[PDB]
Design an enzyme around this catalytic site. Structure first.
Site, PDB file in Angstrom:
ATOM      1  CD  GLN A 167      -3.170  -0.660   0.200  1.00 41.77           C
ATOM      2  OE1 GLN A 167      -3.531   0.507   0.069  1.00 41.77           O
ATOM      3  NE2 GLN A 167      -3.735  -1.660  -0.457  1.00 41.77           N
TER       4      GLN A 167
ATOM      5  N   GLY B 202       1.369 -10.160   9.653  1.00 45.82           N
ATOM      6  CA  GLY B 202       1.802 -11.533   9.491  1.00 45.82           C
ATOM      7  C   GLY B 202       2.924 -11.684   8.490  1.00 45.82           C
TER       8      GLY B 202
ATOM      9  CE1 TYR C 101      -3.936   3.567   8.050  1.00 43.67           C
ATOM     10  CE2 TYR C 101      -4.759   1.513   7.169  1.00 43.67           C
ATOM     11  CZ  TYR C 101      -4.286   2.251   8.220  1.00 43.67           C
ATOM     12  OH  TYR C 101      -4.153   1.664   9.453  1.00 43.67           O
TER      13      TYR C 101
ATOM     14  CG  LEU D 104      21.046   4.473  -0.356  1.00 42.13           C
ATOM     15  CD1 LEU D 104      20.451   3.213  -0.934  1.00 42.13           C
ATOM     16  CD2 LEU D 104      20.158   5.034   0.725  1.00 42.13           C
TER      17      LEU D 104
ATOM     18  CD  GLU E 277      28.302  10.424   1.272  1.00 37.68           C
ATOM     19  OE1 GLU E 277      27.623  11.381   1.690  1.00 37.68           O
ATOM     20  OE2 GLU E 277      29.191  10.550   0.403  1.00 37.68           O
TER      21      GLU E 277
HETATM   22  N1  GTP Z   1       0.327   3.449   6.902  1.00 35.00           N
HETATM   23  C1  GTP Z   1      -0.293   2.311   6.549  1.00 35.00           C
HETATM   24  N2  GTP Z   1      -0.407   1.359   7.485  1.00 35.00           N
HETATM   25  C2  GTP Z   1      -1.008   0.199   7.202  1.00 35.00           C
HETATM   26  C3  GTP Z   1      -1.537  -0.023   5.870  1.00 35.00           C
HETATM   27  N3  GTP Z   1      -2.077  -1.241   5.868  1.00 35.00           N
HETATM   28  C4  GTP Z   1      -1.906  -1.755   7.095  1.00 35.00           C
HETATM   29  N4  GTP Z   1      -1.278  -0.887   7.881  1.00 35.00           N
HETATM   30  C5  GTP Z   1      -0.884  -1.105   9.273  1.00 35.00           C
HETATM   31  O1  GTP Z   1      -0.159  -2.319   9.307  1.00 35.00           O
HETATM   32  C6  GTP Z   1      -0.535  -3.077  10.436  1.00 35.00           C
HETATM   33  C7  GTP Z   1      -1.205  -4.358   9.970  1.00 35.00           C
HETATM   34  O2  GTP Z   1      -0.329  -5.081   9.125  1.00 35.00           O
HETATM   35  P1  GTP Z   1      -0.703  -5.439   7.630  1.00 35.00           P
HETATM   36  O3  GTP Z   1       0.379  -4.966   6.742  1.00 35.00           O
HETATM   37  O4  GTP Z   1      -2.097  -5.052   7.372  1.00 35.00           O
HETATM   38  O5  GTP Z   1      -0.577  -7.030   7.736  1.00 35.00           O
HETATM   39  P2  GTP Z   1       0.062  -8.015   6.667  1.00 35.00           P
HETATM   40  O6  GTP Z   1       1.489  -7.671   6.504  1.00 35.00           O
HETATM   41  O7  GTP Z   1      -0.758  -8.083   5.450  1.00 35.00           O
HETATM   42  O8  GTP Z   1       0.037  -9.433   7.419  1.00 35.00           O
HETATM   43  P3  GTP Z   1      -1.170 -10.492   7.544  1.00 35.00           P
HETATM   44  O9  GTP Z   1      -2.382  -9.822   7.044  1.00 35.00           O
HETATM   45  O10 GTP Z   1      -1.151 -10.693   8.975  1.00 35.00           O
HETATM   46  O11 GTP Z   1      -0.737 -11.663   6.752  1.00 35.00           O
HETATM   47  C8  GTP Z   1      -1.457  -2.197  11.257  1.00 35.00           C
HETATM   48  O12 GTP Z   1      -0.664  -1.513  12.224  1.00 35.00           O
HETATM   49  C9  GTP Z   1      -2.042  -1.256  10.232  1.00 35.00           C
HETATM   50  O13 GTP Z   1      -2.470   0.009  10.711  1.00 35.00           O
HETATM   51  C10 GTP Z   1      -1.374   1.066   4.900  1.00 35.00           C
HETATM   52  O14 GTP Z   1      -1.796   0.945   3.753  1.00 35.00           O
HETATM   53  N5  GTP Z   1      -0.758   2.170   5.304  1.00 35.00           N
HETATM   54  N1  GDP Z   2      34.704  25.126  -0.394  1.00 33.76           N
HETATM   55  C1  GDP Z   2      33.970  24.033  -0.718  1.00 33.76           C
HETATM   56  N2  GDP Z   2      33.770  23.086   0.221  1.00 33.76           N
HETATM   57  C2  GDP Z   2      33.051  21.973  -0.099  1.00 33.76           C
HETATM   58  C3  GDP Z   2      32.506  21.794  -1.429  1.00 33.76           C
HETATM   59  N3  GDP Z   2      31.835  20.624  -1.456  1.00 33.76           N
HETATM   60  C4  GDP Z   2      31.968  20.069  -0.219  1.00 33.76           C
HETATM   61  N4  GDP Z   2      32.670  20.908   0.577  1.00 33.76           N
HETATM   62  C5  GDP Z   2      33.119  20.692   1.938  1.00 33.76           C
HETATM   63  O1  GDP Z   2      33.861  19.435   1.866  1.00 33.76           O
HETATM   64  C6  GDP Z   2      33.590  18.670   3.038  1.00 33.76           C
HETATM   65  C7  GDP Z   2      32.762  17.447   2.645  1.00 33.76           C
HETATM   66  O2  GDP Z   2      33.581  16.642   1.784  1.00 33.76           O
HETATM   67  P1  GDP Z   2      33.254  16.308   0.281  1.00 33.76           P
HETATM   68  O3  GDP Z   2      34.294  16.829  -0.669  1.00 33.76           O
HETATM   69  O4  GDP Z   2      31.886  16.738  -0.206  1.00 33.76           O
HETATM   70  O5  GDP Z   2      33.313  14.703   0.446  1.00 33.76           O
HETATM   71  P2  GDP Z   2      33.983  13.643  -0.568  1.00 33.76           P
HETATM   72  O6  GDP Z   2      33.339  13.650  -1.919  1.00 33.76           O
HETATM   73  O7  GDP Z   2      33.852  12.335   0.193  1.00 33.76           O
HETATM   74  O8  GDP Z   2      35.444  14.022  -0.618  1.00 33.76           O
HETATM   75  C8  GDP Z   2      32.773  19.568   3.947  1.00 33.76           C
HETATM   76  O9  GDP Z   2      33.640  20.226   4.865  1.00 33.76           O
HETATM   77  C9  GDP Z   2      32.070  20.526   3.008  1.00 33.76           C
HETATM   78  O10 GDP Z   2      31.740  21.776   3.617  1.00 33.76           O
HETATM   79  C10 GDP Z   2      32.784  22.872  -2.382  1.00 33.76           C
HETATM   80  O11 GDP Z   2      32.348  22.776  -3.541  1.00 33.76           O
HETATM   81  N5  GDP Z   2      33.497  23.918  -1.966  1.00 33.76           N
END
Ligand code: GTP
Ligand code: GDP
Ligand code: TA1
Ligand code: TA1
Ligand code: GTP
Ligand code: GDP
Ligand code: MG
Ligand code: MG
Lengths: 429, 441, 429, 441
Positions: free
Chosen positions: D15, D144, D224, D252, D254
């Site tokens: 959902q 579940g 929902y 990701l 980082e």
């Molecule tokens: N935010 C959100 N929460 C949801 C939704 N559907 C279910 N929930 C929540 O999820 C929990 C229930 O789990 P579900 O995901 O419905 O269960 P399921 O994973 O299908 O597992 P079973 O039905 O037990 O096989 C409750 O806390 C619900 O409020 C949704 O669409 N959005």
């Molecule tokens: N002066 C300057 N600082 C930067 C720039 N980009 C990132 N920084 C600085 O660089 C540091 C972050 O490292 P960054 O170069 O982005 O990471 P890296 O790609 O892993 O080397 C932080 O202190 C930021 O403020 C830039 O274009 N100019």
């Protein structure tokens, strides 16, 4: 040549300062963009004093602006000469002082003085030799009273041998535009006795008086009180910038004008002040300027000069003159006024004669005088102070920012010693 | 940029907030749907100043306002009226029942559990601003949420913010006319946290503005729409220096330094110069000496309070519009000559002048019109002590009979809370007897 | 003539490198297709340094690109200058490092270093004489910290007598864009003490500071931090490429600038940095460049230079100058700052004056300085390191790739000996 | 090219897979019948990136998806809906009976004999890809097949693939609201293989997203369909750096280096900034400092879990759209100042910023709309230990009474399996008590 740094603190400070750099500019013939388009070559020789150069033929004043708490920022920037100041100089913070001394000297001043003095040192070392540190501030207020005298505690500390003139606007006996005002004058005169070589006591009442009793102006706005102050501010440094026949630095005045190191509170005058179109019924001569300078209704400190003895005075004459009529008019006043001066000084008045007038005028002057009649400006505050302090009236807005009660009694002890060292020489012997 | 947070509380606070935000939108040019089509013609200026208006990127403007009343009936007028789409849609209603005019439902019962939405909303609003803060609180004494819920809102904002300036604009119970019989109970319990936490408490009144709307404005039947505009003209020229370009601006921190001598005498009794009609907008000069002399006579105080039976301590003349700073000192040396306008010995300075020079604008729909200048004098006099003794007397007359009190102690509050609020107001009235009397030697 | 190979590792490396070869190109006047269309004949004499020739009048940089793990591949290729690099140089693999040191130095680095060094040797023997191996890498990351210091272990091995400059972007005290970052700095400074002649410590905070406190930029993007780094990268090799009046190779710097063979961690500055349109209120002179170079708010390493003594500094001046104002401005700073330098060295500052400015400017400079104030960049990491290592916090993502715990204690012993050999000379004697 | 294999399991997993693959087809331009008529107008770009989409020679695109549920009723919605012809027709149904909510029918009875179709289908799918792998598993605890069959699918994919990164996105039972009475039995037996094999387990919850759909989105009746789009916006900006062009991409691998301190504390509690309405898409600035401060208040965590009662260990701010990298550090030095946002001693670095600058798109049909930036903060706090103690307590309260257990041991599983799954969760909860407590000297 000799170069001056101008600092502006308090909101009264840059408002005088924005009119100040317009009088200086038109005296040198310099447009809002700093491009020199003057009439003669005689006003380029000391641009170095106030305006250091820039890249293409443009001139920038050495004007630090401490006071631009942002209510005043975009009016001085969006003004006549907001395109002339260097924008790094506009040093300020947030949450301004609040007509509080302790929020100028202890809390917000301490977190701003490092950003000011990092610009003060960058304007000192761009200079061949400094002597002058003009600080346009005002007592009574916030920034201009706590932060204005925090820098003088620091700038005199880092420069113990510079002439430190602070054109200090003072409180009034009737015009009370601040309720806390006898605190911001007592705590700031305590700083300006120790840390300045000269300081000019200017009041608003004697500036309100001249615009009514002499200049006959219908509505004197705040621009027309600063236009009178600034005509003195460009009258002390005239002999620095322009050639003359008897020159006077900011130091030949402040060696002559001051007997003892605490007695340096001055009252400035100006002449000719008169009200006309283009038809006026007088004649600009050297005896005509003299009677108006010494007249008790053309001071600026709002005290009565005939109540006390002048210690010594300085008459900085401008324009084309004759030195016999200068040295003889300054003689006859001293003889007709033998009680109105101090007897036990040989000659009280000194003379300073430049050779370039203002733009429109033919002659002018500036009466800078050291008198014992300024005991009245310090007795009135010290009566208003001890009335408020006896009840401990407004103190919890100050002790709640870090101060102590034993700094208030230190400040009133210092101002009461000036009145003791003014009542003495006002007496005869 | 300097800014305020306007927190209206109660029905009195929200009803004033109908017209305070009606006035701000007309000065700056903001329509009732956030846009600014006035300055688009010129093409410059940021006039929707960030003191009162957050700005979003789509050109819309949002105020700094939040209001809580514990009753949906008041705010559903705002959520359906003309100012529907202007405000942010978090105007905190959530009250499943009204307070019912007591301090105990109130500070304790239903004010709690709704305050958790309130403080977090202020934190989501205060952290968008750099610089000056100030909480413009709007409530009334005497009511249930204006007295009770504000008292919970102050002790929970004097901890999460500390020393920030809090200007709270309270409508005080009149000594002769009261629209509730339990209003003397609420307006003595709300003083125990107004005195401690809120640094500056502007008291106004309804009877003293009724006479102004009858004598000067010449309106025979003034409804609550026509009273809240006069408070709105006052609140504008209190926070006018934070927005507009003046010759002597007075910050909200400059009030605290000047108006308030001692930490517990902060009650400064606002005024205005509303002698517009506008038939009498002619026939009259209205100069600086005229509008400054409007504060002389006790027929223009906004509180039913006679200033001639007490001293003054400190005043704050705040002008608007075409004011020249020379004309002010003529209108001040006059006032220091008049011998019934009486000061204390210990404040020889007296006054403080804030000259903003933006003229006060006219809300279309009555009831005054375009005057060229104004004044909002703020002066904590000693005379406010006799305005409280006519309210402690209403408290003490029905405290001996143990009236109305089972709905106060039967809602969580202890019955000992009443005498704790009496021992403040007896001692706070005792403070005004000492300050006005000078010392002899 | 003297020829340099530029290597780019880590994703920070080529992002600086893509802006690097745009500053170099416009300094020589060379289009995206490598066709020379320059203004003068003076910028063809040392194309040989960075750009070896091709068949018809086209020029190719000797730029190896180790770091193009394919997320960065089709942005550098699909960039401004993706049609200038030689496409065999784009050496990479799959499944990049993952902000892991051991996945840069031991597992994916070992299966890629043979494909890099087969291109390094094919770019060495196409040269008359090599001296320079510029490696633009960054600490903290993955590829730039493990694989960037795997090549220096190999290239210094196959070339024991080449000047190996690595412009190493370092971690920050507040700006933490990597959670594992005190591991990738400790394990890489352990390699860059032994295997480089000079390495420039650049931080992002002092690059974020200049774009706000000095350049007044509203939104400084990542291009405008690399545009400041690259203005130094083309400022060290200026005297190689252009004629001057006092030349300085990459080796006259790295013989003067380094007292002892471990003390070679530099902080680079640049001047003039200022914020304008076309109206700026200053004047480009030799004393104007000097105060900005030495100013503590125009470093790049984000440490306070007034906390420690400069060992020795190098001021690589450009543009048309005068050697008296060069040798006297470098004198007065050393006298006003007698505690801020090391007393027991005769003259600390050296000078290098080229004769060709940048394109738009009139003059420029480069402050390369060796200071003991860089003890703060190594004490902060060594406190963050031993906080993580005491709990053995993130080690199972490293010991699960082949390392041992007895290489972590080897790396912190080496960095703690730099702080011992920096605290010594920071002290007075 | 780097790629993922998205393996949905259960009804919860399928959902969610209705809407994760609804989102991917709209970003890249792929219609529900495999074609790409959007980029045919421009005539360039390979935007149906090979991370999620195998490409055949006839222009059609096929996802990397396989899903098993042991019940035809769920997948027959997919085989007759709008996405009928998109997926490959090997969507593994084959269950002659549902699991009936237990782990024993399940890991043992009918999960076996259907797994032989599953692993061979992954091998027919994994061997078409060069480069990075990562198994995006989708299931729920408590069910579940989401609990039982995933547990068989992990120990049979940690052998045929070894050290590949496995990001499994589990829906966790809420502490207050449970849609089954045997759900505390299944969500303690599925931990014994989630802890061992799957390197990184993103837990979300249904009650903490119910409050987000009521308070922020202002939806009074969220079905929902409207919950699975918010998980789909999260899953997009987890695997957004594998597709789009960013200024700091985070692979990701980082995640594994940064998010996971110790090999058994991989439970990082995702969030988002879903304050769109879209009436409130106006009225609000939504700057970098605004959306980063959305993680402060515990009313925006995706798990019913209070982070203020626990430390943090490592966080991972992952941005989208118009983000300037300068504004981020202002919104991080702020967070390191606030004293309730509490770290451990042993991680002084704290954060990690991944700035992708492709804006998140809008699924037409509600319920949010076009914001200019987003954030998916991933932070393994210590506070998830109190989210398990409210589930071990539900296990232990009906384990003393020997309830429901004859349908677990009477399906092949031994009754000793329950205490083997209790001695993990007692000891795994004991691990979070040690890591949060610093050492003193
Ligand atoms: N935010 C959100 N929460 C949801 C939704 N559907 C279910 N929930 C929540 O999820 C929990 C229930 O789990 P579900 O995901 O419905 O269960 P399921 O994973 O299908 O597992 P079973 O039905 O037990 O096989 C409750 O806390 C619900 O409020 C949704 O669409 N959005
Ligand atoms: N002066 C300057 N600082 C930067 C720039 N980009 C990132 N920084 C600085 O660089 C540091 C972050 O490292 P960054 O170069 O982005 O990471 P890296 O790609 O892993 O080397 C932080 O202190 C930021 O403020 C830039 O274009 N100019
Ligand atoms: C036809 C004619 O002669 O007009 C005169 C004039 O009528 C009078 C009344 C001028 C006039 O001044 C004023 O009315 C005034 C207004 C505000 C504040 C102070 C004065 C004048 O405006 C001022 C102006 O002053 C100058 O030009 C000086 O250089 C003066 N400049 C400025 O203050 C200034 C004003 C605007 C812009 C830039 C500079 C100055 C004085 C000292 C130091 C530097 C500059 C002058 C002589 C006149 C007018 C024009 C009417 C007077 O003032 C000055 C400063 O000279 C006022 O009393 C004097 C006597 C002058 O005769
Ligand atoms: C009208 C005018 O003079 O404009 C200047 C300018 O206003 C200023 C502000 C420039 C400007 O630089 C920046 O604003 C800037 C932007 C990002 C990163 C760094 C700086 C300028 O853009 C940069 C440009 O620089 C160059 O032309 C140099 O040759 C420089 N080139 C590049 O960086 C470059 C940029 C784009 C494409 C290719 C090369 C350089 C410096 C060192 C080594 C090699 C090249 C210059 C002088 C200016 C502008 C154009 C406004 C300044 O920078 C440089 C590098 O000169 C910033 O402070 C200086 C002072 C300059 O006066
Ligand atoms: N000026 C003005 N006064 C008002 C308004 N509404 C109420 N009041 C006054 O406020 C007092 C009553 O308090 P309300 O604000 O109505 O009471 P509440 O705060 O809603 O409290 P409960 O109703 O008791 O919960 C009386 O003195 C009224 O005259 C208004 O809109 N304007
Ligand atoms: N002459 C003059 N006086 C001013 C001006 N602005 C304020 N004042 C006076 O300055 C004092 C108030 O201080 P102010 O400078 O406004 O306060 P600050 O900003 O706290 O320093 C009062 O005595 C005012 O009359 C001005 O522009 N000119
Ligand atoms: Mg009500
Ligand atoms: Mg099912």
């Amino acid at each position: 040549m000799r170069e001056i740094v101008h600092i502006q603190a308090g909101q009264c400070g840059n408002q005088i300062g924005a009119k100040f750099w317009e009088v200086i500019s038109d005296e040198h013939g310099i447009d809002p963009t700093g491009s020199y388009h003057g009439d003669s070559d005689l006003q380029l020789e000391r641009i170095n004093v106030y305006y250091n150069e820039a890249t293409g033929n443009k001139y920038v004043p050495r004007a630090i602006l401490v006071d631009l708490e942002p209510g005043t920022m975009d009016s001085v920037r969006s003004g006549p000469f907001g395109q002339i100041f260097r924008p790094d100089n506009f040093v300020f913070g947030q949450s301004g002082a609040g007509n509080n001394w302790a929020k100028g000297h202890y809390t917000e001043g301490a977190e701003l003085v490092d950003s000011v003095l990092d610009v003060v040192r960058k304007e000192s070392e761009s200079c061949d030799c400094l002597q002058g540190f003009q600080l346009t501030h005002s007592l009574g207020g916030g920034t201009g009273s706590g932060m204005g005298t925090l820098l003088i505690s620091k700038i005199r500390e880092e420069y113990p041998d510079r002439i430190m003139n602070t054109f200090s606007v003072m409180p009034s006996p009737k015009v009370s535009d601040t309720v806390v005002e006898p605190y911001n004058a007592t705590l700031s005169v305590h700083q300006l006795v120790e840390n300045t070589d000269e300081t000019y006591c200017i009041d608003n009442e004697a500036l309100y008086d001249i615009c009514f009793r002499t200049l006959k102006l219908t509505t004197p706005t705040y621009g027309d009180l600063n236009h009178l102050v600034s005509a003195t501010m460009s009258g002390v440094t005239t002999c620095l910038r322009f050639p003359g026949q008897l020159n006077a630095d900011l130091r030949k005045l402040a060696v002559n004008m001051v007997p003892f190191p605490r007695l340096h509170f001055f009252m400035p005058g100006f002449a000719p002040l008169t009200s006309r179109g283009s038809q006026q019924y007088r004649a600009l001569t050297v005896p005509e300027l003299t009677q108006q300078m010494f007249d008790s209704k053309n001071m600026m400190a709002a005290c009565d000069p005939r109540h006390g003895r002048y210690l010594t005075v300085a008459a900085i004459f401008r324009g084309r003159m004759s030195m016999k009529e200068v040295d003889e008019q300054m003689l006859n006043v001293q003889n007709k006024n033998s009680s109105y001066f101090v007897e036990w000084i040989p000659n009280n008045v000194k003379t300073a004669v430049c050779d370039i007038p203002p733009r429109g005028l033919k002659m002018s002057a500036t009466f800078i005088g050291n008198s014992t009649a300024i005991q009245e400006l310090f007795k009135r505050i010290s009566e208003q102070f001890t009335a408020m302090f006896r009840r401990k009236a407004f103190l919890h807005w100050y002790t709640g920012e870090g101060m102590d009660e034993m700094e208030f009694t230190e400040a009133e002890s210092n101002m009461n010693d000036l009145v003791s060292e003014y009542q003495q020489y006002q007496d005869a012997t | 940029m300097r800014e305020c947070i306007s927190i209206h509380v109660g029905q009195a606070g929200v009803q004033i907030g109908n017209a305070c935000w009606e006035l701000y939108c007309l000065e700056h040019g903001i329509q009732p749907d956030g846009q600014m089509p006035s300055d688009k013609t010129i093409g410059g200026g940021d006039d929707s100043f960030n003191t009162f208006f957050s700005e979003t990127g789509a050109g819309k403007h949002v105020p700094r306002a939040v209001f809580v009343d514990l009753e949906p009936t008041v705010i559903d007028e705002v959520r359906t009226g003309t100012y529907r789409q202007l405000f942010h849609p978090e105007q905190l209603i959530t009250g499943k029942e009204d307070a019912a005019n007591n301090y105990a439902r109130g500070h304790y019962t239903i004010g709690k559990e709704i305050i958790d939405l309130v403080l977090d909303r202020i934190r989501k609003l205060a952290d968008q601003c750099t610089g000056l803060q100030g909480f413009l609180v709007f409530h009334s004494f005497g009511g249930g949420t204006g007295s009770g819920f504000t008292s919970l809102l102050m002790e929970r904002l004097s901890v999460d913010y500390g020393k920030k300036s809090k200007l709270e604009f309270s409508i005080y119970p009149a000594p002769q006319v009261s629209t509730a019989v339990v209003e003397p109970y609420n307006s003595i319990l709300t003083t125990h946290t107004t005195l401690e936490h809120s640094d500056c408490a502007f008291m106004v009144d309804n009877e003293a503005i009724y006479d102004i709307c009858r004598r000067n404005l010449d309106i025979e039947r003034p409804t609550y729409t026509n009273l809240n505009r006069l408070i709105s003209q006052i609140v504008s020229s209190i926070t006018a220096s934070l927005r507009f370009d003046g010759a002597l601006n007075v910050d909200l921190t400059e009030f605290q330094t000047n108006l308030v001598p001692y930490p517990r005498i902060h009650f400064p009794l606002a005024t205005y110069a509303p002698v517009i009609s506008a038939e009498k907008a002619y026939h009259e000069q209205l100069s600086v000496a005229e509008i400054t002399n409007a504060c002389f006579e006790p027929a223009n105080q906004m509180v039913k309070c006679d200033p001639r039976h007490g001293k003054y301590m400190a005043c704050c003349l705040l002008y608007r519009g075409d004011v020249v700073p020379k004309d002010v000192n003529a209108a001040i040396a006059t006032i220091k000559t008049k011998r019934s306008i009486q000061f204390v010995d210990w404040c020889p300075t007296g006054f403080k002048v804030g000259i903003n020079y933006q003229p006060p604008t006219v809300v279309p729909g009555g009831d005054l019109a375009k005057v060229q200048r104004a004044v909002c004098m703020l002066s904590n006099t000693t005379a406010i002590a006799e305005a409280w003794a006519r309210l402690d007397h209403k408290f003490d007359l029905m405290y001996a009979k143990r009236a109305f009190v089972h709905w106060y102690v039967g809602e969580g509050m202890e019955e000992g809370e009443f005498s704790e609020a009496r021992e403040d107001m007896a001692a706070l009235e005792k403070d005004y007897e000492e300050v006005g009397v000078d010392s002899v030697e």
